[PDB]
């Protein structure tokens, strides 16, 4: 438990062993569980010394200790990571990636992961210094199972951080370079490696449809669905995020998701006790019901409409908003037969009960869905019966109240509904 003053005294000595002991003391100080004195270490001007120690091939222990200390400094605020980067640490860590000592290369991997995880600027800077090639060289083995577990986990997490963040998204050539190894890792058995690989894929699929296409071309969707059917929440969460991102794309990518059998997992997802899982799954379903009519039909065949009715009847309010969106997309793109099936499953009463919420957007979505169902009934001539249903569940009173809403669109649409049908 040295003081920063003693650490500085030792590091400023012309004795490599005293410097090593002071650097180890700094590492232990920065590795304590409560409030590491990162700012105090920075103010003492110690980062340049640690960076210089990173290059002492003659003394591997001081390399390791300084790498650990700099890793922990770079794990803090953006200003602290920036202090690490300004010391010239990026190229030193990249040079250490090829060290013959596995623990030192692993520490360099960790440090680069923190730096890249700061944000898109430092991510792209790490990429410009040439980290991807040595990082992937570390994983160029016939069987990943021969690598140490922690080493593989750290490599996967750092790679995921290189795939992370937008504005801008990672360089396309870098994504193309990394994706094959990402597929390999996505077929690994370790739960943490799988979780971090799924997170990386979720990052890569979060953007324009061209990036989604880069990912889907690798054939990972079946594996993503298999992982979606996993037991570990830390794996299901990123897998579900990636699947949702993918189905935000073209009808062909959504169809790739459907063909892999994803819908068969949604009975559980739409009833998952974790609210975030339910919300993400309902959002995915809403984007799926915004697709082609055969895709809505596949949603119907898997028996998911009753699950949407359930989520609409009882769930977190945000999940209910996602379900209202799903219903509006369904009724906007669906055939008259599918809309009638939706009505037969009991959508009217929950959709009308949700009109009492103090949220304008869900109100407008629900009114659009009601208009679509009424158009279907008109096409069938059952508008009268549907109005009877809406009146029995107390919904006519809700639309009558919406008449006097503080939003133009809401009042206008409620008026149109009551005058064109009621």
């Amino acid at each position: 438990n040295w003081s920063v003053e003693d650490i500085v005294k030792g590091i400023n000595s012309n004795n490599l062993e005293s410097q090593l002991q002071a650097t180890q003391a700094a590492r232990k100080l920065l590795s304590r569980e409560k409030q590491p004195p990162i700012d105090n270490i920075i103010r003492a001007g110690l980062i340049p010394k640690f960076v210089s120690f990173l290059g002492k091939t003659d003394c591997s222990p001081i390399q390791f200790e300084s790498a650990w200390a700099l890793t922990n400094i770079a794990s803090g605020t953006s200003e602290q990571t920036k202090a690490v980067v300004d010391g010239g640490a990026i190229p030193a860590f990249i040079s250490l990636l090829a060290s013959p000592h596995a623990h030192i290369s692993e520490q360099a991997v960790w440090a680069l992961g923190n730096i890249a995880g700061d944000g898109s600027a430092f991510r792209d800077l790490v990429i410009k210094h040439g980290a991807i090639d040595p990082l992937l060289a570390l994983l160029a083995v016939p069987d990943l199972s021969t690598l140490a577990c922690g080493y593989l986990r750290n490599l996967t997490w750092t790679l995921s951080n290189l795939c992370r963040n937008k504005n801008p998204a990672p360089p396309l050539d870098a994504v193309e370079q990394i994706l094959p190894t990402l597929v390999r890792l996505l077929h690994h058995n370790d739960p943490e490696v799988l979780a971090d690989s799924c997170w990386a894929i979720s990052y890569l699929t979060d953007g324009p449809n061209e990036r989604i296409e880069m990912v889907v071309k690798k054939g990972v969707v079946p594996q993503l669905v298999k992982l979606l059917g996993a037991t570990e929440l830390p794996i299901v969460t990123p897998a579900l995020r990636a699947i949702g991102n993918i189905v935000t794309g073209t009808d062909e990518q959504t169809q790739k998701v459907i063909d892999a059998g994803a819908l068969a997992v949604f009975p559980s997802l739409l009833t998952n006790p974790k609210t975030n899982i339910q919300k993400e799954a309902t959002w995915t379903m809403s984007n799926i019901t915004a697709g082609r009519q055969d895709q809505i039909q596949q949603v119907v065949n898997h028996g998911l409409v009753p699950f949407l009715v359930g989520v609409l009847s009882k769930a977190d309010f945000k999940t209910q908003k996602e379900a209202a969106w799903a219903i509006t997309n369904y009724t906007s793109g669906g055939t008259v037969e599918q809309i009638v099936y939706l009505v037969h499953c009991g959508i009217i009463e929950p959709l009308m009960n949700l009109l009492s919420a103090k949220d304008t957007k869900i109100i407008q979505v629900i009114l659009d869905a009601i208009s679509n169902i009424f158009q279907a009934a008109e096409k069938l001539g059952e508008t009268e019966k549907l109005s009877i249903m809406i009146e029995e569940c107390g919904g006519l009173d809700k639309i009558e109240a919406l008449q006097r809403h503080e939003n133009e669109s809401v009042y206008k649409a409620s008026l149109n509904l009551i005058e064109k049908y009621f």
Binding site: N72, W110, D118, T248, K318
Partner: peptide, 12 residues
């Protein structure tokens, strides 16, 4: 993310 070493709607 950062780690310390111890010891269609595109948006929802």
């Amino acid at each position: 993310e950062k780690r310390r070493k111890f010891l269609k709607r595109k948006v929802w």
